[PDB]
Design a binder for this molecule. Structure first.
Ligand SMILES: [Zn+2]
Ligand SMILES: [Zn+2]
Length: 55
RNA sequence: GGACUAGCGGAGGCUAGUCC
């Protein structure tokens, strides 16, 4: 238990850290970062991918 | 508060509902 919100995993939540699917940044082993899982630039995000569209 | 169901999210919170 502890953190029922974790149930979000029931929707193959996406890791906002690495940008994978199956775990969240919270449950992400990687350190708290902000590397666009699109271009690989640390600072911006996919939503604001200054490289290319967001799928 | 908890747990679910939902739902979205670059941030995981929020609410509702039911239960006490
Ligand atoms: Zn991750
Ligand atoms: Zn980018």
């Amino acid at each position: 238990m502890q953190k029922g919100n974790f149930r979000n995993q029931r929707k193959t939540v996406k890791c906002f850290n690495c940008g994978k699917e199956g775990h969240i940044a919270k449950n992400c082993r990687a350190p708290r970062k902000k590397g666009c899982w699109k271009c690989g630039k640390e600072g911006h995000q996919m939503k604001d991918c200054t490289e290319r569209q967001a799928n």
